[PDB]
Symmetry: D3
Subunit: 151 residues, 6 copies
């Protein structure tokens, strides 16, 4: 048929620390998705509270914010037909315990607390996050040489 899309994928502190950046990026590349934007940064607690506003009234919130600020993250935007839905499928269940082998979480992590990566839950959330994490001039627009072979 219906239309392509866009999604926000972020590699959490543990994913970076355990050296899974290349593996994660590689997987998206080999799938046929395109890297619109990518930056490495240590998200401030302020920025993170904004990212987790819908969970500010959840027990874990404080820990989650302290957590995501403990180390640098890799924030990215991937484009493609249904990126949000399939992207999350590639990520696996948010709880590594339910993530099936073959998926990023299912292959690389164990606990929900340390689930190495984040994927937007919907197109509505995707655009929100993308705006919160990226500046419009950061989203690079180019055309993949194999685009016509993926679509």
């Amino acid at each position: 048929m219906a239309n392509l899309e866009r999604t926000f994928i972020a590699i959490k502190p543990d994913g970076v620390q355990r050296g899974l950046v290349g593996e994660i990026i590689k997987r998206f590349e080999q799938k046929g998705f395109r890297l619109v934007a990518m930056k490495f940064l240590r998200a401030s607690e302020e920025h993170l509270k904004q990212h987790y506003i819908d969970l500010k009234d959840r027990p874990f919130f404080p820990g989650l914010v302290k957590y995501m600020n403990s180390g640098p993250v890799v924030a990215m935007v991937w484009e493609g037909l249904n990126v949000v839905k399939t992207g999350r499928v590639m990520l696996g269940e948010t709880n590594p315990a339910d993530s099936k082998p073959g998926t990023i979480r299912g292959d690389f992590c164990i606990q929900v607390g340390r689930n190495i990566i984040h994927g937007s839950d919907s197109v509505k959330s995707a655009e929100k996050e993308i705006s919160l994490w990226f500046k419009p001039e950061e989203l690079v627009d180019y055309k993949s040489c194999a685009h016509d072979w993926v679509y």
Copy 2:
């Protein structure tokens, strides 16, 4: 138981173009299936119409034929206990959208139009396709050194 089998596996133009030949063959090798035959060729529209006879009364047919002729493909025959059934599972759903991560399609493609590969839907179709794509002197008969460790 009950008996082995044999199936027709074809790597479509997009699979070849995006450089997934080695990956796809490799996957079948590591599983324990044996390469009976393999050839690289640009299937003529005529040959393709024959391959897709059961879909000659379907809207997409004309495009499908034009499609499969746009570039060379890698036609192969793989032998093994239940190759047809398991081979397809290894391929993933025909619609990349439903292909689960870990499968060829699930890991390498996005759209059904460009689903990089083809596997026989049944033993009956397998034998038909094998005959349509290969000459009897092209199916090599040998024995894998690890055969007794697989079976």
Copy 3:
């Protein structure tokens, strides 16, 4: 939561012969599990009968014993939150025919007879097997440098 765990993973003769030792170990490593103990040995028929006591009445038993003694195996102990349950999920169904792509059996084997690997079915079994296969001074205790990033 609730508590960690510990499980017994054994790479069968066919798994060793087909050179899948590195792949199998690698997989457990990348998941975040820790190698507590590992040894390479040709399990005697006596030792194997003990391992398969619960099946000493079934027709396959004598073959299974002769089988597992036909070549060396790699016996290991892996520690982690829910190792027994997730470990088996990583292994796939005991019957390679039902093992999903992405899993060890699903990627590397075909027949149940030659299913390349064994994982404990439960914590109760795990501890039994661990005792049967390893000596208490063989289970090494150390701390993975990325432990706090997995947990």
Copy 4:
């Protein structure tokens, strides 16, 4: 020783387009180097002329600038003992024809024109480039959990 170091690694338009970002990053990670900074951008011709000042009189200069602006690049900073020297070794010869198998260039490219990646030629150049490509607040400082095992 004697002291660590810091180097500027940039994945050129062709390296991105051919989907080698993950492979390249992965290699540096597995080596024990640490990602200090990373950003995805389409370097402007102006910015590129500055990057290639020492070559602004050579026959190729204009082409080189037009080239590097044709698609987005991945700019990074890697830290580690002798990153500049070893990093380039990992990259291979600047001319893919002389790059040995096992290296990034030796494994992934053919022509010098399209040599997929750039590595600083010296610590002096490294700091220059790092300043030209990154803002001081972009270089993230954290400690790898396996630092004491690499050092």
Copy 5:
């Protein structure tokens, strides 16, 4: 330058038997070389003697022929700037003993008797071999979607 090229690459019986087809093809794909033609067949002793005419008066010849006929091989043609020269470098020394790690032979074989693969020693030999192993209508002519990113 000066001009491209084309070369004859053949995966010997041992390479096929040990399951290195996917790995070897994959390596050529990731380099940017294009598969012009590929077939799976058991080279007849007669055909092989022709291939080894320049060694028909050498001690090993008799065995070499018996050898190459013992199992099926994978004959292929790869196009690219300097394929013959670089292709051989990718293969490693003909004597696995001197093949450096990172090369096909260096990573996968030990003895010269079983050196898993063959590459043309020169453009002149290449064309000879291509003609001896392939029929002109078997060399497929297409254009890789990433061609302009490789050259």
Copy 6:
């Protein structure tokens, strides 16, 4: 031749900690070498002093002993034509700074202090170490199914 051989390969504490066990083993497997014996253990300082007798009068000795006892190691014995010589080539230079990309050390480590692995320098040393680290009954003798394809 002239004759086969055998060698002692030990994965050091850092190699284990950084999760490179599967990678290292995998590499020896894919080469065609056979695993004769393997055990996981924390080598006592006593046992280590014996292993490093020839260096007991060298400055670093005390540290080297404390070092190798800091974590568990994976001790193995690999059989094959020229294992000692080629094995070390696969390991790379003892000083990771000189280890070429493609080799274990060249791909995974940086400092000599933490060079992740050990390989015997000679057949004379190999047998010494093998005796020092393994008990005769631990060296398993079996035959690789692809032996005739490697030799």
